[PDB]
Design a protein around this nucleic acid. Structure first.
Lengths: 159, 58, 169, 292, 222
RNA sequence: GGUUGCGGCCAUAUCUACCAGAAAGCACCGUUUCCCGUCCGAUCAACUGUAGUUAAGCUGGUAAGAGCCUGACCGAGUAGUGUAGUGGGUGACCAUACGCGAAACUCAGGUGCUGCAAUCU
RNA sequence: GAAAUCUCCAGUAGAACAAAAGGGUAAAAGCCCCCUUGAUUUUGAUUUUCAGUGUGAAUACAAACCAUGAAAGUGUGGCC
RNA sequence: AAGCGAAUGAUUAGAGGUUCCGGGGUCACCUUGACCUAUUCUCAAACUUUAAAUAUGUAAGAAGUCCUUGUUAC
């Protein structure tokens, strides 16, 4: 028959990276997780208690609960035509701080700095992130750089 | 006799017809499954905050 | 030179590999205890073969290890069985050396009836000060290449000591 | 011997502090971990390390960047307080545990309460929380790799900290004099160990047995001409002083760090740069191939 | 039970299915010898190299490899001698072909269930070849280029697909062209290793390099 | 700057061979009444820094060193791939168009940094 | 004696972990030893199978009482 | 995809190195039985260091940022 066990097709998902086996580096146990923090679940195969299901590997969600050695993470799962709120009780070494969040935080601090600076001088600071605009005009000089010609190579078998 | 056993054809097209909608979260999400020791206190914190506010609000 | 780098006895291990277990092993145990002044331990067979009459946990051998002056005195008191004269082999690629004998009961202690007569193997463990560095619990390390013992180093210690000589073939 | 490239390529080295063998990381996980509902509270560790000729005690709290020290007591600082020789014995380990214990209690301003034991009868008494007051400062004994045994120095520092008013969790199974025929630790025997009782009787026994060992060892006691029965007096003189001024007066620290850096710099080898390395390979090639 | 025509297994329709601990009852390959001629020649003896290269992505049966191997070797050996060349079969038949055997007797429908349980039993071995992948390599002297051309243009007839004969610029079976190989071998950088050569590395322990290529360092001091 | 105690990242730190180390520490080292453990005070436990030693550990340097790390307009825009065509070809497959884009290889460099506390000619 | 027992050296795991395979594990999750019964109670929350039903299995807790440890901790059956 | 002068499994060839766990030819005798070292060819759905493209999770704020002090039996 067909097997749909709790850890099917995890032959590689619950590996330990090359020359990264063994004990977990301790900083993960020293990270601090507050309710509302956005974390992502890279399951660590070394320790098998409180493991996430293979679906949640690489999934990101807010932390709704903080426990003795685990946290409660709310992940959203696509179940048919709608999403469901899944709540996970994960050991603290299966998760890590998403750095996408803190990047937004640092911009937020920057925007407040740019606003407070704009208070005195420099109105219209344009806090918006612009997309990569097309490059404006320029002058390309030719000193030491007379354009060397190029012609397609003849075909040799090379082998 | 024999037929198709499983097919995911048109399942994604069906799913999006009425859209795939997020669960439209809320301020104050439900406090279920969170630690009973935490919640047992969060009540008393809210009880005190209301009494302090009402005393301030006369 | 250096008094620390001086080569010294570490321990002598004294094993009897016996086919069976029982009153033979009880007598073989208490000949080693009266030999070295300390009881030996019965090493057990880790595999069965049906050709040696051995089962697991059978305790088919007794060996004891001795260190210090008592080990010192027992060493020459066995090499005189073959007269402090040994082989170019028997010297490991590490320095540790050993030999074999066949009797102790009437050798250096008073004989008594119901003791049995047993052969047995000497083996000398032979290193240099700083051997806690490889055995201490914390900061356990490895001896250096200059501090490693080797065959030609223990034979020289075997020449300067016991006024002995090698290669009697 | 001459390991294959493949082996040294697939080799996972352990953590550096396991490679040198100093740190047990299996235990450190369950020491420095914290109940996650205690978000940022440090879990202070009482690290007690017994090097030859010195004892190290230090209250350590773990951070992401590493470990920070609250206050560290060593056993080359007891001479300030009266204990001159035997800076490693069981009683001295008790002394330095008391030193760090009082040092932290006066550091955190809890010293006025939590006097530990004023009279020290060497009994198993934890520091009970004083009602209507801040709870006793709680530290956890991280022995390290030292094996736990009944009646050891590392647990001497524990008892010194417990008597110092500091709440170290423990039981009597490891304190010297623990009974196997009953659950009763021997008070007199452990009080002897606090005050050199295991040393004083040995000193006296060698005094009334011979003189060479009593002279080769214990010559420090013979150098200042003190008796084994005087050990209690000098140890109590230590204990009272530690209760008085545990403020950790440092040393004078002569020959300031600028000279210290300069002196060590002139003697330590330097790593050759690229060009001179090429010079020492281009010359080496000619010397090893010079009609050879 | 007879062999099926090669047209049935010509194309690379299935994933690689080698002999493995899953696949224990495989028949042995018909090609067993991959090097022929003076295979112990030094690399200086045979500077010329000519290749039989596939232009298609197909599967070559072990029997085809054997049959072409025989054909090329026999022709070259008869024309220029046994020791005038070194022929190397580059490709190895690791892919196991599977056969579902159908009964061809009257009333077979009763004894055989058609396509039910059709997992074929291991039938033979094949070599998966890609476009531009070398099938045969021959190293010889520049003299016998036409002879090995004919030998290689006589092995092709035994191969399915379209293969082309191309003479190569590399020195023998080495990865480096003629002029800079000669550059190294002139400057003592080359040591014979029976059928191939070792090259001096500008990297590694200087003592081992010195021991193994003394002539290079002597030429540097002259 | 050296060392130690605790560590962070966990080989730029590992591995092999050699060599060096002024002072301080570390270590080796010295002894079994008590605590304690083994067959053995080797381990472990206890005791003195007392007889010494850098021999070793440890630290640092050397290697056209292996390994590891980073980079390369090095391989290579290569393989592969998403999209498109009433493109090619009997087919197998290939080329093109708009995009993304390796890995091995070649070469170059490097070979631990740092936090807390204490200590050091 | 190939292979009985001992000693030393090398040994990134090439062993063992009850049983399939896969993953995990080196002062350990392996081997040897000491102590036990958490393989307990009250229910609830959650993940997988999913209708987000059940069953099964599992995860994190809480309130207890215990075990063990010197402690941190670990333990609500078997490393997954 | 790539990779086996990287692990595991396979694999072709040649070259260099032996214990009294056999020279099979004169008791340690030039004497073919190995494995190891370095190369070489070709591979792998149930091999892999590395590793795409596509598909994929989150975030891009007023339910947010910052300052101050209030409740809790945590």
């Amino acid at each position: 028959g067909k097997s749909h066990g709790y850890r099917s097709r995890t032959r590689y998902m619950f590996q330990r990276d090359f020359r990264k086996h063994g004990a977990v580096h301790l900083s993960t146990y020293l990270k601090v997780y507050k309710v509302g923090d956005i974390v992502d679940i890279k399951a660590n195969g070394s320790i098998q208690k409180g493991m996430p299901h293979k679906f949640y590997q690489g999934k990101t969600g807010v932390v709704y609960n903080v426990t003795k050695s685990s946290v409660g993470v709310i992940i959203n799962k696509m179940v048919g035509n709608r999403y469901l709120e899944k709540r996970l009780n994960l050991r603290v070494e299966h998760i890590k701080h998403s750095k996408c969040r803190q990047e937004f935080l640092e911009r937020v601090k920057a925007n407040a700095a740019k606003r407070a600076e704009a208070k005195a001088q420099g109105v219209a600071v344009q806090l918006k992130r612009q997309p990569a605009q097309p490059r404006e005009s320029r002058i390309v000089s030719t000193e030491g750089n007379v354009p060397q010609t190029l012609a397609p190579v003849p075909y040799e078998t090379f082998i | 006799a024999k037929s198709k056993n499983h097919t995911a054809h048109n399942q994604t097209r069906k799913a999006h017809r009425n859209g795939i909608k997020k669960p439209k979260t809320y301020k104050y999400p439900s406090l279920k499954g969170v630690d009973p020791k935490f919640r047992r206190n969060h009540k008393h914190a809210l009880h005190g905050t209301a009494k302090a506010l009402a005393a301030a609000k006369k | 030179q250096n008094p620390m780098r001086d080569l010294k006895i570490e321990k002598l291990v004294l094993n009897i590999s016996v086919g069976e277990s029982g009153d033979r092993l009880t007598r073989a145990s208490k000949v080693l205890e009266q030999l070295s002044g300390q009881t030996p331990v019965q090493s057990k067979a880790r595999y069965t073969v049906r050709t040696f009459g051995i089962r697991r946990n059978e305790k088919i051998a007794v060996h004891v290890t001795v260190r210090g002056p008592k080990a010192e005195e027992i060493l020459e008191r066995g090499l005189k069985v073959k007269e402090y004269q040994l082989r170019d082999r028997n010297f490991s690629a590490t320095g540790n050396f050993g030999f074999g004998i066949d009797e102790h009961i009437d050798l250096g202690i008073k004989y008594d009836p119901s003791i049995g007569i047993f052969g047995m193997d000497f083996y000398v463990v032979m290193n240099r000060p700083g051997a806690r560095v490889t055995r201490r619990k914390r900061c356990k390390g490895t001896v250096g290449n200059s501090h490693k013992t080797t065959k030609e180093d223990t034979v020289s210690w075997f020449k300067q000591k016991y006024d002995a000589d090698v290669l009697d073939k | 011997d001459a390991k294959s490239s493949a082996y040294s390529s697939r080799f996972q080295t352990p953590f550096r502090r396991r490679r040198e063998g100093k740190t047990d990381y299996y235990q450190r996980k369950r020491l420095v971990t914290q109940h996650k509902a205690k978000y940022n509270t440090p879990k202070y560790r009482l690290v007690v390390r017994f090097t030859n000729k010195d004892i190290i005690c230090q209250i350590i709290s773990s951070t992401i960047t590493g470990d920070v020290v609250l206050a560290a007591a060593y056993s080359h600082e007891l001479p300030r307080y009266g204990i001159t020789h035997g800076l490693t014995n069981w009683a001295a380990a008790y002394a330095t545990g008391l030193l760090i214990a009082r040092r932290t209690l006066q550091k955190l301003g809890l010293d006025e309460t939590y006097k530990g034991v004023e009279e020290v009868e060497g009994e198993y008494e934890l520091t009970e929380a004083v009602e209507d007051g801040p709870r006793p400062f709680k530290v956890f004994l991280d022995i390290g790799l030292q094996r736990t045994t009944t009646g050891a120095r590392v647990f001497g520092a524990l008892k010194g900290a417990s008597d110092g008013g500091l709440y170290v969790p423990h039981s009597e199974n490891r304190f010297p004099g623990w009974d196997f025929e009953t659950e009763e630790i021997d008070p007199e025997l452990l009080r002897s160990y606090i005050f050199g009782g295991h040393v004083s009787q040995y000193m006296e026994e060698l005094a009334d047995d011979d003189e060479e060992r009593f002279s080769e060892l214990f010559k420090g006691y013979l150098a200042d001409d003190i008796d084994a029965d005087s050990l209690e007096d000098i140890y109590t003189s230590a204990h009272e002083a530690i209760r008085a001024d545990p403020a950790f007066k440092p040393t004078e620290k002569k020959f300031t760090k600028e000279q210290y850096a300069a002196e060590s710099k002139k003697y330590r080898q330097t790593k050759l740069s690229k060009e001179e390395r090429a010079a020492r390979v281009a010359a080496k090639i000619a010397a090893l191939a010079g009609q050879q | 039970m007879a062999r099926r025509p090669a047209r049935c297994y010509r194309y690379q329709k299935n994933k690689p299915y080698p002999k493995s601990r899953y696949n224990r009852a495989v028949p042995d390959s018909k090609i067993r010898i991959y090097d022929l001629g003076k295979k112990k020649a030094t690399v200086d003896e045979f500077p010329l190299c000519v290749h039989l290269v596939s232009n298609e992505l197909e599967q070559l049966s072990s029997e085809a490899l054997e049959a072409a191997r025989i054909c090329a070797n026999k022709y070259i050996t008869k024309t220029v001698g046994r020791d005038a060349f070194h022929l190397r079969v580059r490709v190895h038949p690791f892919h196991v072909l599977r056969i579902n055997k159908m009964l061809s007797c009257a009333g077979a429908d009763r004894l055989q269930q058609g396509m039910r349980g059709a997992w074929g039993k291991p039938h033979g071995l094949a070599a998966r070849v890609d476009i531009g992948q070398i099938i045969f390599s021959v190293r010889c002297k520049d003299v016998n280029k036409p002879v090995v051309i004919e030998g290689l243009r006589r092995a092709r007839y035994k191969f399915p697909g379209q293969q082309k004969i191309i003479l190569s610029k590399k020195w023998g079976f080495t990865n480096l062209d003629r002029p800079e190989y000669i550059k190294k071998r002139d400057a003592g950088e080359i040591k014979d290793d029976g059928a191939f050569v070792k090259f001096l590395s500008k990297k590694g322990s200087l003592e081992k390099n010195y021991n193994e290529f003394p002539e290079y360092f002597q030429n540097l001091s002259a």
